[PDB]
C-alpha cells in the first residue's frame, strides 16, 4: 500500500455517484487520516474524533453527538463492533435549515472508511458501501 495509492482509492468515491466525501483514515499505531477527498470535512479528522468513533463507551454518542472535521453529526445506529457488520450510521446536523447529508463509517483492520452522501442520498446504500469498502480493505491487510 502506498499514499498516492490510498488518494486514488478515496477519489473513486467521487465518481461513484453516491458520494461529496470520503476518507480512509487509520486507528490503531497510524491514527490520522491517510487520504481524503479534497475540500470535504473528513481531511479535517482528528485523533480525538477517530477515539470517540472507536471507543469502548458506545451510548453516550447518542446523547452528545460527535464531530468529524469539527462538524457536529448525530448517531443513528452502531454496528461498528458487531464483527459480521462494522459500520455506523451518522446524519450530519444543520444548521438552521441547510441539508442535512447521511455519513456511513465501516472498519477494518487498522483503518475506517468514511463515506458522506450527497444531498438526499439515503444512508442504506452508503452503508453498503462502506461495509463493502472495510471488507476489501481488510482483505488486502488493512
Known amino acids: 500500500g502506498s499514499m498516492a495509492g490510498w488518494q486514488s482509492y478515496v477519489d473513486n468515491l467521487m465518481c461513484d455517484g453516491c458520494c461529496q466525501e470520503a476518507a480512509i483514515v487509520g486507528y490503531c499505531d497510524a491514527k490520522y487520516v491517510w487520504a481524503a477527498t479534497a475540500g470535504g470535512v473528513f481531511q479535517s479528522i482528528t485523533p480525538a474524533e477517530i477515539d470517540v468513533i472507536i471507543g469502548k463507551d458506545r451510548e453516550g454518542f ?38 442535512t447529508y447521511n455519513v456511513a463509517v465501516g472498519r477494518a483492520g487498522r483503518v475506517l472508511v468514511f463515506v458522506m452522501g450527497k444531498e438526499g442520498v439515503h444512508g442504506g446504500g452508503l452503508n453498503k458501501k462502506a461495509y463493502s469498502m472495510a471488507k476489501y480493505l481488510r482483505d488486502s491487510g488493512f
Not at 446523547?63 to 469539527?70: A, H, I, P, S, V
Not at 462538524?71 to 438552521?96: A, F, H
Open 62 to 99: 447518542f446523547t452528545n453527538g460527535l464531530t468529524l472535521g469539527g462538524k457536529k453529526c448525530s448517531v443513528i445506529r452502531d454496528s461498528l463492533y458487531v464483527d459480521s457488520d462494522c459500520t455506523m450510521d451518522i446524519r450530519t446536523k444543520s444548521q438552521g435549515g441547510e441539508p
